[PDB]
Amino acid sequence: FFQPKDEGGYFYFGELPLSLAACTNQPHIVNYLTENPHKKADMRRQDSRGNTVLHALVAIADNTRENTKFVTKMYDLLLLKCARLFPDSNLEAVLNNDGLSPLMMAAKTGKIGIFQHIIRREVTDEDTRHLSRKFKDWAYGPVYSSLYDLSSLDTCGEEASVLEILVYNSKIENRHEMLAVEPINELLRDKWRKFGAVSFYINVVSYLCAMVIFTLTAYYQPLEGTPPYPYRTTVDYLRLAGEVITLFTGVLFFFTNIKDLFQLLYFIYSVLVIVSAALYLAGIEAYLAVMVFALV
Amino acid sequence: VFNRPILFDIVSRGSTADLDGLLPFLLTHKKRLTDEEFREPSTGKTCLPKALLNLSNGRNDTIPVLLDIAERTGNMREFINSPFRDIYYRGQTALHIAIERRCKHYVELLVAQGADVHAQARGRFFQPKDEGGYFYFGELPLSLAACTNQPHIVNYLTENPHKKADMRRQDSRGNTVLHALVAIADNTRENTKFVTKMYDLLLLKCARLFPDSNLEAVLNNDGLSPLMMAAKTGKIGIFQHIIRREVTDEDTRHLSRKFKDWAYGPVYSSLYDLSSLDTCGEEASVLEILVYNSKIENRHEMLAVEPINELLRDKWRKFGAVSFYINVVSYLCAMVIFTLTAYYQPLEGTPPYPYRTTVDYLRLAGEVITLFTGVLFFFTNIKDLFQLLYFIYSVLVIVSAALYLAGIEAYLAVMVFALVLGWMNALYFTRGLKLTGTYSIMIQKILFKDLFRFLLVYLLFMIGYASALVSLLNPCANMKVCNESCRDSETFSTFLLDLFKLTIGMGDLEMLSSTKYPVVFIILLVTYIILTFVLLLNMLIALMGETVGQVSKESKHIWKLQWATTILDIERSFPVFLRKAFRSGEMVTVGKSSDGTPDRRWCFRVDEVNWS
Numbered sequence: 001f002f003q004p005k006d007e008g009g010y011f012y013f014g015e016l017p018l019s020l021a022a023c024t025n026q027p028h029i030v031n032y033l034t035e036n037p038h039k040k041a042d043m044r045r046q047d048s049r050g051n052t053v054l055h056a057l058v059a060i061a062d063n064t065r066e067n068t069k070f071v072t073k074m075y076d077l078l079l080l081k082c083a084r085l086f087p088d089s090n091l092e093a094v095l096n097n098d099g100l101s102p103l104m105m106a107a108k109t110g111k112i113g114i115f116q117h118i119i120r121r122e123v124t125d126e127d128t129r130h131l132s133r134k135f136k137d138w139a140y141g142p143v144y145s146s147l148y149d150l151s152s153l154d155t156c157g158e159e160a161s162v163l164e165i166l167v168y169n170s171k172i173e174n175r176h177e178m179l180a181v182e183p184i185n186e187l188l189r190d191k192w193r194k195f196g197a198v199s200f201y202i203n204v205v206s207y208l209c210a211m212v213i214f215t216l217t218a219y220y221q222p223l224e225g226t227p228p229y230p231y232r233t234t235v236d237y238l239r240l241a242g243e244v245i246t247l248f249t250g251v252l253f254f255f256t257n258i259k260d261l262f263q264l265l266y267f268i269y270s271v272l273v274i275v276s277a278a279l280y281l282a283g284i285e286a287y288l289a290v291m292v293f294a295l296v
Numbered sequence: 297v298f299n300r301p302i303l304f305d306i307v308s309r310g311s312t313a314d315l316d317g318l319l320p321f322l323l324t325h326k327k328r329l330t331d332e333e334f335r336e337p338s339t340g341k342t343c344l345p346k347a348l349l350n351l352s353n354g355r356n357d358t359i360p361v362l363l364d365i366a367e368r369t370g371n372m373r374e375f376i377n378s379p380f381r382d383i384y385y386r387g388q389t390a391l392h393i394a395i396e397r398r399c400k401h402y403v404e405l406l407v408a409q410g411a412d413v414h415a416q417a418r419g420r421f422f423q424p425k426d427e428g429g430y431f432y433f434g435e436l437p438l439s440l441a442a443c444t445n446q447p448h449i450v451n452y453l454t455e456n457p458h459k460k461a462d463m464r465r466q467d468s469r470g471n472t473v474l475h476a477l478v479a480i481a482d483n484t485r486e487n488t489k490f491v492t493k494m495y496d497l498l499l500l501k502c503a504r505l506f507p508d509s510n511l512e513a514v515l516n517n518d519g520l521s522p523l524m525m526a527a528k529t530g531k532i533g534i535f536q537h538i539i540r541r542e543v544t545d546e547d548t549r550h551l552s553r554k555f556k557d558w559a560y561g562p563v564y565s566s567l568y569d570l571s572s573l574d575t576c577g578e579e580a581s582v583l584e585i586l587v588y589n590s591k592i593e594n595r596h597e598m599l600a601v602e603p604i605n606e607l608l609r610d611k612w613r614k615f616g617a618v619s620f621y622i623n624v625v626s627y628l629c630a631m632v633i634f635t636l637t638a639y640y641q642p643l644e645g646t647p648p649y650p651y652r653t654t655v656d657y658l659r660l661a662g663e664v665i666t667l668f669t670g671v672l673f674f675f676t677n678i679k680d681l682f683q684l685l686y687f688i689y690s691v692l693v694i695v696s697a698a699l700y701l702a703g704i705e706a707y708l709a710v711m712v713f714a715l716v717l718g719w720m721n722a723l724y725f726t727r728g729l730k731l732t733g734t735y736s737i738m739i740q741k742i743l744f745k746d747l748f749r750f751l752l753v754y755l756l757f758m759i760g761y762a763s764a765l766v767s768l769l770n771p772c773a774n775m776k777v778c779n780e781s782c783r784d785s786e787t788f789s790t791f792l793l794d795l796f797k798l799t800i801g802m803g804d805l806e807m808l809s810s811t812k813y814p815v816v817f818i819i820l821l822v823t824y825i826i827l828t829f830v831l832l833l834n835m836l837i838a839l840m841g842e843t844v845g846q847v848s849k850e851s852k853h854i855w856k857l858q859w860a861t862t863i864l865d866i867e868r869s870f871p872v873f874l875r876k877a878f879r880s881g882e883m884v885t886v887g888k889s890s891d892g893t894p895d896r897r898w899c900f901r902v903d904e905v906n907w908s
Contacts, residue, residue: 141396141444142480143431211760219763223786225770286771289816292764296824 004059014056015047022053022078023060025070034081043082043091050097051105053078058106061114063174068113075114076121083128090131100160101152107162110172116181119148148183163187210249214295217242221288229283246294247277269294297321300334307347312358319365329365330374342378345390354399363409376411386419387435395441400448413437413453413461416468424479434476435467442473442498443480445490454501463502463511470517471525473498478526481534483594488533495534496541503548510551512891520580521572527582530592536601539568550889557882557901564904567881568603571892576864576872583607587860596853599860606902607878608856611863614877619866624725630669631718637662638715641708649703666714667697682724689717727858737850741843750836754828758799759792761824765817766791772814780805801829 423429727733
């Protein structure tokens with residue numbers, strides 16, 4: 001009954017009385033259970049699913065106005081609580097059984113509201129503001145040089161950066177809309193005007209050149225039967241230099257997909273180029289038949 | 297006192313408790329606080345700007361004490377003039393910072409002791425946002441208060457029982473406070489409201505205090521009027537307001553734009569001025585920059601203002617359609633005459649110059665006026681020193697003239713180029729009446745982008761597959777079974793010809809079963825031709841069907857844009873000083889005090905209807 005609604009469950013709050021009060025929006029109960037002149041619980045202890053109260057709080061979050069308002073401030077309340085009462089580490093760093101951050105789980109299931117808020121929020125009182133996200137640098141009248149943090153936004157597959165789950169593994173109804181947030185939409189242009197178009201154009205021009213070279217080596221072959229390996233003369237150096245770089249493109253696109261252990265087509269390309277390489281190494285009839293498959 | 301850091305700490309704290317009794321040391325060791333070593337040489341900031349940079353509630357009450365110290369040295373001038381020196385923050389006398397933080401008290405003091413009412417901080421930080429700049433206000437303290445919307449500061453700096461600045465002095469970019477005020481103007485409600493009235497405030501100020509000339513007349517380094525710069529960057533709001541505004545109090549209303557003539561109940565014969573609206577390239581009239589040089593996101597919308605939209609019709613119903621029809625009919629006649637002289641020529645070889653008989657007077661009279669149209673369209677574009685096509689027309693007509701003057705063979709070859717290119721240019725007139733020129737919209741996308749890239753990629757596809765097939769005859773032995781005319785050969789490219797003939801989506805090529813001739817060749821051929829000839833062109837057909845629904849405003853908009861372009865160049869083609877449109881107006885004292893010109897002060901009259 002307490003599992004999420006995709007495992008036959010009816011309501012999943014987090015299997016913890018503290019989180020049970022949290023999701024159900026009973027702040028006074030939270031203040032009591034966190035601290036009271038008796039037994040008291042720490043939001044430290046995660047659940048039987050790897051989650052602590054924050055992750056749960058994100059789970060049952062929704063996008064309707066009501067299911068954003070209260071949860072927004074409740075999250076910050078409990079965060080500041082854990083901060084003050086544990087002013088050495090932070091709660092945000094703790095990961096679930098899948099090792100995801102609460103921000104990560106916010107991204108995956110596409111919870112717009114809580115994510116849109118957690119990306120901006122800054123701690124006003126500088127007493128302990130050392131967990132804020134948005135900063136300030138200077139305001140010369142009408143222009144604020146605002147400064148957005150990036151610490152789990154981009155590390156290229158080293159700690160499951162959020163942008164990765166946004167781009168590759170996301171099949172989310174709100175995947176598009178979430179990208180409209182400032183420090184992501186801008187980061188697109190930032191990675192674009194540098195290292196964005198340069199390598200893209202390099203790759204497209206090199207690919208077109210390789211394909212035209214394969215066409216070249218195709219049309220200038222000895223025709224009318226008998227395809228053995230004829231490389232013995234200077235004019236055949238052209239075909240030799242074309243086929244070696246053909247096999248080179250093959251092994252390169254092979255290495256591209258073996259590192260994954262339009263995502264396999266360029267690999268089947270390499271497979272057929274290797275078929276061609278073997279068949280031409282044999283140098284027997286009915287063996288150029290795969291060169292045409294490779295070209296097409 | 298002991299170092300630059302200690303005093304910076306003292307002042308950033310905000311209490312002179314650590315500064316008291318330091319001035320007798322300063323005088324003791326002749327330490328003049330003006331000295332530069334107490335400035336971090338990275339930029340040059342001194343005690344005062346570092347002080348004012350830190351502000352609690354608007355009061356860091358050691359500042360007057362520090363200035364007392366400066367006068368204990370006996371120096372304020374060197375002190376209060378300590379401009380920042382680098383490429384990021386250049387100049388920027390402390391007064392700029394004080395005004396930016398907006399504590400009119402410290403403003404009062406600094407100005408009273410007297411800093412300067414001029415410091416042109418040209419640090420790249422202060423450039424516009426298209427030269428790496430972050431904020432461009434106008435390099436003048438007065439304009440700095442203006443843009444930042446601090447009216448009281450404006451009243452103080454304009455006039456006060458001390459040094460005071462005149463909005464006369466332009467910037468290091470040719471601009472005075474009005475031009476700047478237009479620069480940082482925007483189109484959002486907020487960035488229109490305050491700037492609207494601030495502009496009028498400062499304008500009336502300059503008027504009253506300089507009631508001989510006007511500020512509006514002063515031009516920037518590019519010689520543009522503030523109204524001009526408003527037009528160019530497409531600032532709708534400030535422009536829409538400056539075109540209507542009229543000075544209510546007739547004491548000095550001799551700068552207003554809209555006037556009144558009579559109101560017979562519900563009809564007001566309102567009268568809009570035109571003094572920088574139209575002079576045909578003599579003083580950079582605003583309509584010119586609106587029509588020719590404008591590539592503005594709001595170029596269309598700004599035209600919706602009354603005394604411009606009406607002026608279109610005004611120049612249309614007179615001198616608008618007459619010369620347009622004259623030009624189109626004369627052009628069609630010239631082209632049909634060139635066709636005439638083309639078809640009636642001596643054929644079957646031998647094109648010398650045969651003009652010796654009466655029947656050849658027809659060809660002579662046709663070719664002379666052909667060369668005349670050529671030299672005319674040549675003169676059209678040489679005055680510029682569908683804007684060069686009619687000139688390349690003339691170039692090729694002159695090629696034809698020279699080649700026929702030679703009268704040798706292979707020399708009529710350019711007459712056909714001339715005829716075909718002229719009948720292509722026939723589209724230039726075919727963009728006016730009857731909603732002609734709709735194609736001229738869609739050709740903007742299909743010829744340059746869509747059909748272009750499609751034909752490129754498809755040609756590459758088919759040539760690659762052609763190499764494939766011409767290499768795919770040796771196994772699957774040489775046979776290309778006769779189509780539904782190259783036979784097995786090795787020459788150079790006849791393959792490509794007959795193969796393209798095959799690729800023609802002409803007749804649904806034969807089907808096979810129990811293969812005897814090339815076996816795996818046919819399946820590749822059929823799947824490829826299905827790919828390219830059942831999807832690609834269909835991809836493009838669907839692309840057309842979806843892209844055609846983009847015409848929203850650019851039908852009437854490109855229609856009146858044609859109006860603008862054509863009509864205005866028409867005016868630009870013949871003597872405008874002749875009796876033309878944009879008629880006269882009411883006489884002096886309601887037609888004087890030049891933003892333009894004589895007592896008539898040429899205006900237009902629009903008859904509005906309203907009930908109230």
